[PDB]
Design a protein around this ligand. Sequence first.
Ligand SMILES: O=C(O)c1ccc2ccc(CO[C@@H]3C=CO[C@H](CO)[C@@H]3O)nc2c1
Ligand SMILES: [Cl-]
Length: 150
Amino acid sequence: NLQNIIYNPVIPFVGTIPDQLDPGTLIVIRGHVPSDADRFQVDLQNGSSMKPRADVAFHFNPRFKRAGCIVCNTLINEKWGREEITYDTPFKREKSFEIVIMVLKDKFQVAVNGKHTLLYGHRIGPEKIDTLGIYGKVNIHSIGFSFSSD
Ligand SMILES: O=C(O)c1ccc2ccc(CO[C@@H]3C=CO[C@H](CO)[C@@H]3O)nc2c1
Ligand SMILES: [Cl-]
């Protein structure tokens, strides 16, 4: 049931999500962190405006300085909300990964390399997400969706 919208996209990548992010929908991202990486992000956006910047329902932002972390947050009218930081990060420089985002009724559930990593409660209705963005120092092998639609 996995339908890739792309392989080996140039970074930054910005793409339209082909169906609604209904409860039960999976987003699967396969990739690798370069050795010199400081951060990268996956942004589920309401639109693709660069100026002013599109609302980000879900900012998933692995950071690599010191013992590393993941910052998750939401951008509404170009303001960030309260950061949700996970200090347990499975991401490392020069390591491949499989990110799985599961869209539930009330939150995203993210697993990496087949292990639970974090939850994040919806602050924008996920039905308002229509765009996926990947920015920063990262190589992406694939991006795909398993929709509730099919
Ligand atoms: O790494 C890159 O090349 C790249 C590309 C596009 C970007 C867009 C935005 C930001 C700033 O991010 C925010 C700064 C501080 O806190 C926020 C989270 O609350 C959030 O992480 N950094 C970027 C970095
Ligand atoms: Cl839920």
